[model samples]
Target: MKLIVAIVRPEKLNEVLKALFQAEVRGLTLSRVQGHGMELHEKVRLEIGVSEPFVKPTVEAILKAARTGEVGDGKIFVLPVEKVYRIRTGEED
Candidate 1:
């Protein structure tokens, strides 16, 4: 499994969500964040956990929907997930 973290422009949230849905990537965590690079901006963070097969599509969705061809479009990070658990059922994946 992997954790895909995408920091995107706040205004692109809806488009990103729709793109993810169309890519069949669901179940994510979203938060409003203050990001600073060359400057500081209000950003939306999307965290999606998925198995190996979904990684490519998930990243593609975010890239396609969140890009604006300008500065501060934000970034994407993919990280390794050592373990995952289903809290409701006490199961691990």
Candidate 2:
């Protein structure tokens, strides 16, 4: 089976989950990630205060849960999972 992973802003998690759930695409994982996108305009206000090298993902979902794209838009990854195991419970998926 395929393993779908998405790294999005903390604000957009709800919408993405809802849409993906409705599509019958379940059993996925997500993580908080930091990266850089389009340059921020002078008028914008950002409080993140992050300054580091960016490891941006190359794939993304087109459904705009928050708003139109404007740099730093979340990232998504679809990988091939050989198997999934619940180490403690010994269950596989």
Candidate 3:
């Protein structure tokens, strides 16, 4: 499994979420986060998971959704997840 995480500005959150949801990458977690970058801008941290093939497209979705052609547009991080489990249903991915 792969974990795709992106830190983006508040204004971009809804657009990003709409784009990702449409792509059917629904396994997502959203967090209100604070950071020090170009300025103290309000930000939202998005986290999603997918199997191998979805990595690149996921990145593209985030980039296309979040980009505003300016500084501190935020960052995307891709990480390898050793394992994942869903507690309520006893499911694993």
Candidate 4:
């Protein structure tokens, strides 16, 4: 199965979750992450924008709001899952 992973703004998690739920895909995962994008972090005329350092709240909520669909929103990674298992009983699926 393919893993449809999405990064969103923290406040947008609810909407993303709602959308995913409406689409009937519930098995997913999320983690706190920080990254610089080629477009979002493209070279600027000055370093003034980057001087504030990383904002914890902003970064923490990066993917919760469907940001990737917009410029400077965020990104999403969809990977392949070849197999899955329930370790407790060694059940493979």
Best prediction by lDDT: 1
TM-score of each: 0.92, 0.50, 0.90, 0.51
Clashes of each: 0, 1, 0, 13
Candidate 4 lDDT at 16 equals 62
Which consecutive 10 residues in model 2 have the weakest lDDT in total? 43-52
Worst 10-residue lDDT window for candidate 4 reads 43-52
Q: What would you estimate as the lDDT of candidate 3?
A: 0.88
Report lDDT per candidate.
0.90, 0.44, 0.88, 0.43
User: Cα deviation of 2 in candidate 2 (Å)?
Assistant: 1.1
Ranked by lDDT from best down, the candidates are: 1, 3, 2, 4
| TM accuracy, model 1 | 0.92
User: Ten-residue segment with the worst summed lDDT in candidate 3?
Assistant: 34-43
Tens-digit lDDT string for candidate 3 (1-93): 889989998899998998888877848999998879456657899899877887888789889999999998999999999989978888977
Q: lDDT per residue, candidate 4, 7-82, as tens digits?
A: 5555556666555444443244555554465434321110001111322223233344355455555455445557
- Score residue 59 of candidate 4 by CA lDDT: 27
- Give the runs in model 4 whose Cα sits over 4 Å from its true position: 38-69, 87-89
RMSD of 4: 13.8
> Superposing all C-alpha atoms, what RMSD in Å does each candidate have to the true structure?
1.6, 10.9, 1.8, 13.8
lDDT for 1 (candidate 3): 84
lDDT of 1 by residue, 1-93 (tens): 899999999999999999888887537899999999767689999999878988987898889999999999999999999999878889988
